[PDB]
């Protein structure tokens, strides 16, 4: 089990005042220990966030540290399974045999750094949940969940809760994710946040954007609508296409950017990707952008910045960070009222919430012809993210929680 961006760096974004409350709350906690544990050290989400959250924490005077459990492919393929199991997949089976490996690997990484010594402990997701077993609780232990436990594979959940039920707090992205069994009192809701200074969100130079745009045959002189999302059947990809076609009936130069990045191990994803290209046919005003052809965080960043309107027609959505990112870039978003999309968007305020494609077409048409209102909604949507979902307000939320 191995180990391992200041606050002032965001001053110009949040203003001294907000910077105060942070430094303020960070005092009645100064010096204490804030440990983080997880599986990977290289990646997005948890990894990417910690890489910034850790240093950022120290900056406010907090002995925060980050350790990473380690194990063989087996241990991960097992956890890979738990992941989906805990995500409703009833066809998965948990065998005592694999049930040991999990506990054993927890035992190996446990036999080392005395995680029980630190003032505060926080474990991210399943893989290291069992750690709270191999130590004697002295300090509070928090469990941060990133997946959805509203309806997990029972034989799997019942095994995990034996561990989770111990922690002093359970942190979920949103309500429709909390485990109903658990005590609504030791549970806390904390949405994932975007780092304004990350590659995906920092402001690129016009020149650089134009380069990326040309490199992918995207014309910035013609209108652009975009939906960045993983390729799967419940993301409204086919509806966005229909919206594009409809809208195109009146705005012939309108371009559609279907942006998405997915792991190699995502057969379904790539399958849906191919079905999309087949559905699109030879209409090349529709761009299908993915890491298959070089689209990464910097390019995703660009595609969003160059967008005039951004859509999110998810049927099944989690917190939806994509909407958050678009909002941060001053873009009006049009989506379906689900998961984090309904929470994040303030209808008619920051963007619009619709129930079908036709409503979506009306709004895109509206927004395309009324740029002032778009600029309007976008600036407000940006303030909503500034005041609600940036990595600093996220950190501030960890303070409160710890204070209590």
Domains 2-193+391-404 and 194-390 share a fold: yes
CATH 3.60.21.10 fits 194-390, yes or no: no
Record the resolution, in angstroms: 2.5
Q: Please state, in angstroms and rounded to a whole number, the distance separating the CA atoms of residues 156 and 159.
A: 5
3-state secondary structure the chain: CECCCCCHHHHHHHHHHHHHHHHHHCCCCCCCEEEEEECCCCCCCHHHHHHHHHHHHHHCCCEEEEEECCCCHHHHHHHHHHHHHCCCCCCCCCCHHHHHHHHHHHHHHHCCCCCCCCCEEEEECCCCHHHHHCCCCCCCEEEECCCCCCCCCHHHHHHHHHHHCCCCEEEECCHHHCCCCCCCCCEEECCCCECCCCCCCCCCCHHHHHHHHHHCCCCCCCCEEEEECCCCCCCCHHHHHHHHHHHHCCCCCCEEEEEECCCCCCHHHHHHHHHHHHHHCCCCCEEEEEHHHCCCHHHHHHHHHCCCEEEECCCCCCCCHHHHHHHHCCCCEEEECCHHHHHHCCECCCEEEECCHHHHHHHHHHHHHCHHHHHHHHHHHHHHHHHHCEHHHHHHHHHHHHHC
Beta partners for residue 287, in sequence order: 257
Distance of CA 348 to the CA centre of its chain: 24
Which residue's structure tokens are 């016009």? 206
Question: Is the four-CA dihedral 11, 13, 15, 18 of positive or negative sign?
Answer: negative
Which residue's structure tokens are 């989506």? 335
How is domain 2-193+391-404 classified at the CATH fold level? Answer: Rossmann fold (3.40.50)
Q: Please state, in angstroms and rounded to a whole number, the distance separating the CA atoms of residues 198 and 298.
A: 9
Taking the domains of the chain in order of start, what are their residue ranges? Answer: 2-193+391-404, 194-390
Return the structure tokens found at 181: 């069994």
Identify whether the C-beta of residue 87 lies closer than 8 Å to the C-beta of residue 114: no
Closest-CA residue to 344 (of 385, 394, 390, 310): 385
């Amino acid at each position: 089990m191995y180990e391992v961006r200041k606050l002032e760096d965001y001053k110009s974004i949040i203003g001294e005042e907000e910077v105060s409350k942070i430094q303020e709350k960070a005092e009645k906690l100064k010096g204490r220990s804030f440990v983080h544990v997880n599986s990977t050290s290289f990646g997005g989400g948890v990894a990417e966030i910690l890489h910034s959250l850790v240093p950022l924490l120290r900056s406010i005077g907090i002995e925060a540290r980050w350790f990473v459990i380690e194990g063989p492919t087996e241990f991960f393929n097992v956890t890979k399974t738990f992941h989906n199991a805990l995500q409703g997949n009833e066809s998965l089976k948990l065998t005592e045999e694999m049930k040991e490996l999990y506990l054993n690997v927890n035992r190996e990484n446990s036999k080392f750094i005395d995680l029980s010594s630190f003032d505060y402990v926080l474990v991210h997701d399943p893989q290291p949940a069992a750690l709270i077993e191999f130590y004697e609780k002295k300090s509070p232990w928090l469990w941060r969940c990133h997946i959805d436990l509203s309806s997990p594979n029972r034989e799997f959940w019942e095994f995990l809760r034996r561990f989770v039920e111990k922690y002093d707090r359970y942190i979920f992205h949103l309500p429709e994710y909390v485990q109903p069994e658990l005590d609504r009192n030791k549970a806390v809701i904390m949405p994932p946040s975007i780092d304004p200074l990350s590659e995906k969100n920092v402001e690129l130079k016009q020149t650089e954007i134009l380069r990326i745009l040309e490199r992918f045959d995207v014309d910035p002189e013609k209108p652009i609508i975009t939906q960045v999302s993983r390729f799967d059947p419940w993301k409204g990809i086919f509806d966005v296409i229909e919206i594009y076609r409809k809208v195109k009936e009146k705005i012939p130069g309108v371009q559609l950017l279907l942006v998405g990045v997915m792991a190699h191990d995502d057969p379904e994803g790539w399958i849906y990707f191919e079905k999309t290209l087949r559905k699109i046919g030879e209409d090349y005003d529709v761009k299908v952008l993915t890491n298959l052809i070089g689209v990464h965080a910097r390019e995703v960043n660009a595609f969003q910045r160059a967008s005039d309107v951004i859509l999110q027609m998810s049927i099944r959505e989690g917190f939806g960070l994509t909407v958050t990112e678009a909002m941060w870039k001053g873009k009006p978003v049009i989506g379906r009222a689900v998961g984090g999309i309904k929470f994040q968007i303030v209808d008619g305020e920051t963007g619009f919430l619709v129930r079908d494609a036709n409503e979506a077409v009306e709004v895109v048409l509206y927004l395309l012809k009324h740029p002032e209102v778009s600029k309007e909604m976008g600036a407000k949507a940006k303030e909503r993210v500034r005041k609600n979902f940036i990595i600093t307000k996220h950190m501030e939320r960890y303070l409160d929680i710890l204070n209590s």
